[PDB]
Amino acid sequence: ALKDDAVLIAARGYVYTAAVGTAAPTPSQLKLIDLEHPEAWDRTGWDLVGHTSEDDLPEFGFDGGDSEVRGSWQKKKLREVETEEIADYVVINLTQFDETALELYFGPNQSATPGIFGVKSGSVVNERALLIVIVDNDVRLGFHARKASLKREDAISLATDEFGALPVRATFLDYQSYNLYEWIEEDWFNAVDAPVVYLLDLGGATGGDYTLLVGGKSTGDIAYNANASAIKTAIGAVDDGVAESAWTVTADGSDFEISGPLAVALGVDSTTGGSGVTVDVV
Amino acid sequence: ALKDDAVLIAARGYVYTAAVGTAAPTPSQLKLIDLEHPEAWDRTGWDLVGHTSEDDLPEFGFDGGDSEVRGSWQKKKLREVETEEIADYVVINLTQFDETALELYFGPNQSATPGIFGVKSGSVVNERALLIVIVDNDVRLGFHARKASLKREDAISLATDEFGALPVRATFLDYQSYNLYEWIEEDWFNAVDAPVVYLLDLGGATGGDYTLLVGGKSTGDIAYNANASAIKTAIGAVDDGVAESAWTVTADGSDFEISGPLAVALGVDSTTGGSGVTVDVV
Amino acid sequence: ALKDDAVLIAARGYVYTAAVGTAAPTPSQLKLIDLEHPEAWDRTGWDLVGHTSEDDLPEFGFDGGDSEVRGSWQKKKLREVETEEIADYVVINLTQFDETALELYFGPNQSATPGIFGVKSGSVVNERALLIVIVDNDVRLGFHARKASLKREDAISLATDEFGALPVRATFLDYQSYNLYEWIEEDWFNAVDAPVVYLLDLGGATGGDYTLLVGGKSTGDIAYNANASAIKTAIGAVDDGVAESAWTVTADGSDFEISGPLAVALGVDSTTGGSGVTVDVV
Amino acid sequence: ALKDDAVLIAARGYVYTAAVGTAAPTPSQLKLIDLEHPEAWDRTGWDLVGHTSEDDLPEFGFDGGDSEVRGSWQKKKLREVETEEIADYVVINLTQFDETALELYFGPNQSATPGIFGVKSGSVVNERALLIVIVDNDVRLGFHARKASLKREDAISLATDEFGALPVRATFLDYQSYNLYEWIEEDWFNAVDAPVVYLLDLGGATGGDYTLLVGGKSTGDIAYNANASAIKTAIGAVDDGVAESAWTVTADGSDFEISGPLAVALGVDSTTGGSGVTVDVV
Amino acid sequence: ALKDDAVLIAARGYVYTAAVGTAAPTPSQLKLIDLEHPEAWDRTGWDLVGHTSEDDLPEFGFDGGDSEVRGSWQKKKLREVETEEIADYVVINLTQFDETALELYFGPNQSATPGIFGVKSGSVVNERALLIVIVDNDVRLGFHARKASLKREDAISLATDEFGALPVRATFLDYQSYNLYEWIEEDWFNAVDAPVVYLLDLGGATGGDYTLLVGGKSTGDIAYNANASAIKTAIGAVDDGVAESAWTVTADGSDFEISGPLAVALGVDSTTGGSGVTVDVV
């Protein structure tokens, strides 16, 4: 079903890299971790890749994935074949010109001299693990790959009035014992299979009567001295194919939990004292 | 044939899925069911796919249908032959990032760990039933397909301003020789040229609680010699169906006429006098 | 003559075999049989050779048919000598590795042990009856050979993105004074011969006049009430028209039925009622 | 006839070699072994050949196979004779460059010094058994020759942007009255009708404590019993390659009829009253 | 025997030449030598042929090697014979027009005059040694022939937009008791049968459990406290054709080194914090 919490805006994030096979922080640790300092974590090998553009967030493209339906003279669609294999990648726009970033765009530094980055002719091999943390309003969706090959995506970009950028493509490659890549958040992947539950709070109501607006459907007034079968029958007047058999309730002193197929809501009540009768989601 | 009532604006909508082959709620039910709460529908286990992008709505595209003319030296238009068969699909932008949406974009989770969603090395297949409901101010056009082969259409999208989006393409396929897809709305397709009126006749009966069924559900309580107004109250509302305002009635002697948004038939009889209760359509 | 159903596109079609000398379905049966199920036919001997390539269709080749001139000093051509007698064959590209299609390419299975298909070094005699049914949009040119000798034509071909194929050549052989092979289709071989016929219907005309196109010329102002002989005169009166005795005309009610050497069709028409004048070829 | 299962696409596969005359795994084993580790096979040594080209797959060619007609003036076609007998071969197109592959292309290493491979002459004899396994998503057409003679087919290919290649022709030869070669698959070449079933009985015994033989292996300790799952386990849950869910066991009387992916037989026996455990084919 | 490090791409490489009989670098020197300065090597006498085309690499062809099988009236298909002796060669496309590259193609300079290179009628001998080094990204497959005879293979190629080229063919000839030619590489020709072994780290994580994925089959759960014999019988428990006699397990203090007939991978980890569980090759 729908939930507003898992709608994502990438308002800040961090890209880290390490030697191949390295472990990212657990889905629990991503809520406690200090993101600025990967030398200080409970598990280590990550270094922060340097500043990445705010204009061009990382793009998780893929090449390939074509297919054709192979026929025979006697049956027009016998099976499909994959005519070019998929290749997933991410493209990242680094914006430091430091050693930590030129070494990902050009590969390993090829001079021993102080103060110089040398690069040398022809095709070259360069590989790393990745961790990407995306964060807004204290929800912290991670992404991790056990290895990728790192390659020049496009020209180094320079302008006089916006930061320079080194576009790099990390093509994802298999590391045998593990997934190709994985997404990390304790609140919303492999979560608890718990139902949505509602609570009725007496609110200190000293007397009088109240109503409920379940699924936007009204019901007749019920006295403040309510009980489980009274609220079951009072909401069970839905007129929407969901009678009193559709609902589950617990006694809970005076502040009943309610469970059922559609949302509980407060109607109108006589406010003899306290807040009056009150409704919540658990 | 100009009709302002059917010039659709897609002001809101909903998208739902299930295991292949499920039935969408019938053309009359779709006008009545509550859209945010699939488990309330009294139909089957449809799941709401999560939030879907509120701009760049679904497009019901097609590929192929190119065709060539084949000539002979003495007749230039002798025959025509299809280059490829018309293959058609809907493309959808999912905007939640939890397992409810990643299930459609990547396929199902490849890891057991709580808080992790793992992705495979390649070639996952993800056939699913699809239902879409488009919602103007009150008109309620549905679309249903028994079997669609879901896949990724393009890279996932991220921004610091706009919501993130996962684009999926759902190609339609043959399920048990049934329709490839179908559009469901009671008032627009295969419409009745005049309102359906059911007729009842008690057959000279003179006793008993002999009672109807409506919309496929047996009715609570109807009896011999009941007035038309009592029959009006004893329909719909008492069955947790639509209220007394949804229905029309007329009667004289043993004979009654009924109309409303749901079908009518005989539920129970035991023939105290006469030939028993009888029912049909005008 | 020109005909436009007799031009063949081999869009789908089936290949069968049986013991030497056996009978095919007759031309009148072949229109009605179901082709995937040789057990259900009245001619009980047949079985399919499995699936066949969609691109490398059967090739009905021949080799030999080569001859040279003989003469003498006084007279330079006097005899011809047949240098190499013609031998027609068909090359079939089987694409299936079941026993039912290896046993054509390799000859009989050489092992009694279950699940291995043994081959041996000496060449082996292998002869079958052959039937092919080329299904052009449910027009069915059949082909049948009473005896053919089957040999491997070329290497087994394998690919990663196309089906493996087993090219086999069937060379046709004489058998007990039956035909070398025969093509079977009820519509168009040895069928009864008669002139083309045209029909026109005035379509409810209470009055008016009309024109026929004939041999690309036109005949003027025929009234709705003209008799069969009078419209034969109106056709025969055309300047490029053959003699008035060469046409034939007949009539009943609102319609007239016609034959002759040139084609005839509706020109401009007028009526005081009905759908206008109408025409077709019988 | 017309199976879709047997329409092989050779998308992946392996090649192995061994001393002349070596037995392959049987067609029932070939469906359950793992291909990449031939130390595990319960068979004498089938060493892998190394990597083979993606696209230049093995081609099962033949040379020769030509014949001529003999006659006299009275009788033009009385006899036929071979001009060149059939000579079957396969062209394996290797890409690994170490001593694993060079001993097929050049013959055995001529130099005893470490780090060097030398070669000397024409007419180096190089005869070894061959096994090939094409794989197409859990159908596994094996091919086996008791001996082949290997020679180089063509020049060594080198390139700057594609793998080098060492093409070898393996030519098949007769050996010790065995087949020239055997194609191996249990689902295709024999016994594709209803599966074989085996008896078991209490046999009227007053007890029992005696084991089975399954897949030609012994099984864990077992005794006279009421429950068919206690026969399913200890036929399955054995270190022979198959899960217990692959088997089925009946309970229609004192009889426990069994069927599954491997044969079953008597391991140990004694009468103990009764007559015997009775484990023959049904 | 699959070894991904031994699948050669000839991306860069060098060609050298010297007086007949001269010795190449030993396989242990071949990793150390500076390939652009033969004047510096421990093996005196080599110098470079100069630049070679990138498009057309050394072609290690051969001519002849034709063979047939023959027998007698006494005895059918008795013996193979090689009807002409196989003649190996390599073709090198030179591209320098300097004297050091004209001398391979035309033989020695026929003029003493400074600044010209005369050529003369008839045969010229030009026998010399050859060394080739193919450099796939820090593996260096050498090739050496103690005597080759060098003849021009084709026309000098000239073009306006591509380097001009001189194709020379070096035919290989037998010299004293030595091999015809040798491939030199320390890692992978006549090398030791180096064991394949897996290391299960377990370098932390006191508490909880893991599986192992062996031959692609998961064993059951095993705890962090387990000893070598417990790990052995857990690995030996799988269905797949192997038992505790085939495996070895050893320990460096709670850190396990293991070997056997199948590959081993991490499967599933559920141990405590500390990141201890990991398995990889030695």
H, E, C per residue of chain A: CCCCCCECCCCEEEEEEECCCCCCCCCCHHHCCCCCCCCCCCCCCCEECCCECCCCCCECCEECCEEEEEEECCEEEEEEEEEECCEEEEEEEECCCCHHHHHHHCCCCCCCCCCCCCCCCCCCCCEEEEEEEEEECCECCEEEEEEEEEEECCCCECCCCCCCEEEEEEEECCCCCCCCEEEECCCCCCCCCCCCCEEEECCCCCCCEEEECHHHCCCCCEECCCCHHHHHHHHHCCCCCCCHHHCEEECCCCCCEEECCCCCCEEEECCCCCCCCEEEEC
D-E Cβ pairs (cutoff 8 Å, strict): 159
Enumerate the residues of chain A whose CB falls inside 8 A of the CB of residue E213. 177
- Phi, psi (deg, nearest 5) at residue D218: -70, 170
Enumerate the residues of chain E whose CB falls inside 8 A of the CB of residue D122. 64-65, 82, 85-86
Taking each continuous run of H as one helix and of E as one strand, the counts in chain E are 2, 19
| Sign of the alpha-carbon dihedral angle for B29, B33, B38, B41 | negative
**Beta carbons within 10 angstroms of residue B112's beta carbon:** 10
Torsion of CA A22, A27, A32, A35, to 10 degrees: 40
Query: Inter-chain contact C51–A71, Cβ cutoff 8 Å?
Result: no
Interface residues of C toward B, Cβ cutoff 8 Å, are: 2, 4, 7, 9, 11
**Chain C interface, mutation test: which of B69, B78, B79, B123, most C Cβ atoms within 10 Å?**
B79
Nearest to A74 among D2, D9, D11 (CB): D2
- Specify the long-range contacts of residues C275-279, CB closer than 8 Å, at least 24 apart: C275/C203, C275/C204, C276/C203, C276/C205, C277/C200, C277/C201, C277/C202, C277/C203, C277/C205, C277/C210, C278/C200, C278/C201, C278/C202, C278/C203, C279/C198, C279/C199, C279/C200, C279/C201
Strand partners of residue B135: B12
Q: What angle do CA E129, E131, E134 make, to 5 degrees?
A: 165
* Of the candidates D171, C124, C123, D107, the residue with the CA atom closest to the CA atom of residue E68: D171
Report the alpha-carbon distance of residue A12 to residue A57 in Å, rounded. 10
Strand partners of residue B52: B94
To one decimal, the resolution in angstroms is 4.0
Provide the 8-state DSSP code for D165. Answer: B
- Phi, psi (deg, nearest 5) at residue E98: -70, 160
Enumerate the residues of chain C whose CB falls inside 8 A of the CB of residue A83. 161
Q: Is-contact A217 A223, C-beta < 8 A?
A: no
CA dist B109 → A191, A271, B105, B116, E14 (Å): 12, 50, 11, 8, 51
Task: Nearest chain C residue to A68 by CA: give it.
Answer: C161
Q: A238 to chain B nearest CA, in Å?
A: 7
Residues 6 or more apart whose Cβ sits within 8 Å of residue A106: A117, A119, A152
Query: Inter-chain contact B155–A241, Cβ cutoff 8 Å?
Result: no
Query: Inter-chain contact C7–B78, Cβ cutoff 8 Å?
Result: yes
Task: Nearest chain A residue to E213 by CA: give it.
Answer: A177
* Burial class for B192, CB neighbours closer than 10 Å (0-12, 13-18, 19+): exposed
* Of the candidates B107, B96, B10, the residue with the CA atom closest to the CA atom of residue B52: B96
Task: Nearest chain B residue to A180 by CA: give it.
Answer: B121
**Beta carbons within 10 angstroms of residue A93's beta carbon:** 21
Q: Is-contact A101 A167, C-beta < 8 A?
A: no
Structure tokens at A243: 């009678």
Q: Which 3 state secondary structure label does DSSP give B244?
A: helix
Enumerate the residues of chain C whose CB falls inside 8 A of the CB of residue A73. 10, 12-14, 51-54, 57
Residues 6 or more apart whose Cβ sits within 8 Å of residue C193: none
Structure tokens at B46: 């449809």
* Of the candidates E88, B67, A237, the residue with the CA atom closest to the CA atom of residue D105: E88
Task: Provide the phi-psi class of D241: left if phi over 0, else alpha when psi is between -120 and 50, else beta.
Answer: left
Total count of residues recorded for chain A: 282
Contact present, B and D (at least 3 Cβ pairs less than 8 Å): no
**Beta carbons within 10 angstroms of residue A153's beta carbon:** 16
Residues 6 or more apart whose Cβ sits within 8 Å of residue C50: C94, C95, C96, C98, C100, C101, D1, D2, D3, D6, D7
Query: Inter-chain contact C7–B74, Cβ cutoff 8 Å?
Result: no
Report the alpha-carbon distance of residue C52 to residue C15 in Å, rounded. 8
Taking each continuous run of H as one helix and of E as one strand, the counts in chain D are 2, 16
Task: Nearest chain A residue to D1 by CA: give it.
Answer: A74
* Of the candidates E58, E63, E100, the residue with the CA atom closest to the CA atom of residue E84: E63
Task: Nearest chain E residue to D166 by CA: give it.
Answer: E60
One-letter-per-residue 3-state SS of E31-49 = CCCCCCCHHHCCCCCCEEC
Report the alpha-carbon distance of residue B240 to residue B219 in Å, rounded. 10
Q: Is-contact E110 E122, C-beta < 8 A?
A: no
Provide the 8-state DSSP code for D281. Answer: B
CA dist B179 → B23, D234, E136 (Å): 12, 49, 58
Q: A79 to chain D nearest CA, in Å?
A: 9
DSSP C78-142: EEEEEEE--EEEEEEEE---SHHHHHHHS-S----STTEEEE-SS----EEEEEEEEEETTEEEE
Q: Which 3 state secondary structure label does DSSP give D182?
A: strand
Query: Inter-chain contact A6–B243, Cβ cutoff 8 Å?
Result: no
Task: Nearest chain C residue to B72 by CA: give it.
Answer: C7
Report the alpha-carbon distance of residue B132 to residue B126 in Å, rounded. 18
Provide the 8-state DSSP code for E29. Answer: T
Report the alpha-carbon distance of residue B156 to residue B93 in Å, rounded. 9
Query: Inter-chain contact E80–D237, Cβ cutoff 8 Å?
Result: no
Enumerate the residues of chain D whose CB falls inside 8 A of the CB of residue E8. 97, 158, 163-164
Task: Nearest chain E residue to D40 by CA: give it.
Answer: E261
Enumerate the residues of chain B whose CB falls inside 8 A of the CB of residue C2. 74-75
Structure tokens at C121: 């070094």
**Beta carbons within 10 angstroms of residue E274's beta carbon:** 16
Report the alpha-carbon distance of residue B105 to residue D23 in Å, rounded. 48
Enumerate the residues of chain C whose CB falls inside 8 A of the CB of residue B81. 9, 11
* Of the candidates A140, A167, A184, the residue with the CA atom closest to the CA atom of residue A9: A140
Q: What angle do CA E72, E74, E75 make, to 5 degrees?
A: 65
Enumerate the residues of chain B whose CB falls inside 8 A of the CB of residue A10. 158-160, 164
Report the alpha-carbon distance of residue B69 to residue C227 in Å, rounded. 42
Q: Which 3 state secondary structure label does DSSP give D102?
A: helix
Report the alpha-carbon distance of residue D45 to residue E261 in Å, rounded. 12
- Phi, psi (deg, nearest 5) at residue E250: -140, 165
Structure tokens at E64: 């002849």
| Sign of the alpha-carbon dihedral angle for C33, C37, C41, C43 | positive
Q: Is-contact C85 C148, C-beta < 8 A?
A: no
Residues 6 or more apart whose Cβ sits within 8 Å of residue A107: A119, A124, A125, A126, A150
Q: What's the one-letter identity of residue E64?
A: G
Nearest to E273 among A42, A125, A177 (CB): A42
Report the alpha-carbon distance of residue D118 to residue D111 in Å, rounded. 5
* Burial class for A121, CB neighbours closer than 10 Å (0-12, 13-18, 19+): exposed
> H or E stretch including B89?
strand B87-94
Task: Tell me the technique behind this structure.
Answer: cryo-EM
Structure tokens at E272: 């405590």
Report the alpha-carbon distance of residue E170 to residue E104 in Å, rounded. 9
Report the alpha-carbon distance of residue C277 to residue C223 in Å, rounded. 11
Enumerate the residues of chain D whose CB falls inside 8 A of the CB of residue A78. 4, 7
Task: Nearest chain B residue to C8 by CA: give it.
Answer: B79
CA dist B231 → A240, B157, B200, B212, E148 (Å): 20, 58, 11, 10, 112
Torsion of CA A184, A185, A186, A192, to 10 degrees: -100
Residues 6 or more apart whose Cβ sits within 8 Å of residue A181: A88, A130, A143, A144, A145, A146, A172, B119
A-E Cβ pairs (cutoff 8 Å, strict): 16
- Chains with 3+ CB–CB pairs under 8 A to A are B, C, D, E
Q: What's the one-letter identity of residue B238?
A: V
CA dist D29 → B275, D190, D261, E243 (Å): 74, 15, 10, 17
Report the alpha-carbon distance of residue B16 to residue B128 in Å, rounded. 10
Nearest to E189 among D37, D47, D98 (CB): D98
Report the alpha-carbon distance of residue A14 to residue A135 in Å, rounded. 8
CA dist C272 → C207, C252, C269 (Å): 5, 20, 11
Structure tokens at B152: 């990724």
* Of the candidates A279, A277, A280, A278, the residue with the CA atom closest to the CA atom of residue A206: A277
> H or E stretch including C152?
strand C139-152
- Chains with 3+ CB–CB pairs under 8 A to C are A, B, D
Interface residues of A toward C, Cβ cutoff 8 Å, are: 68, 70-76, 78, 81-83
Enumerate the residues of chain E whose CB falls inside 8 A of the CB of residue A42. 273
Report the alpha-carbon distance of residue B78 to residue B70 in Å, rounded. 6
**Beta carbons within 10 angstroms of residue D138's beta carbon:** 6
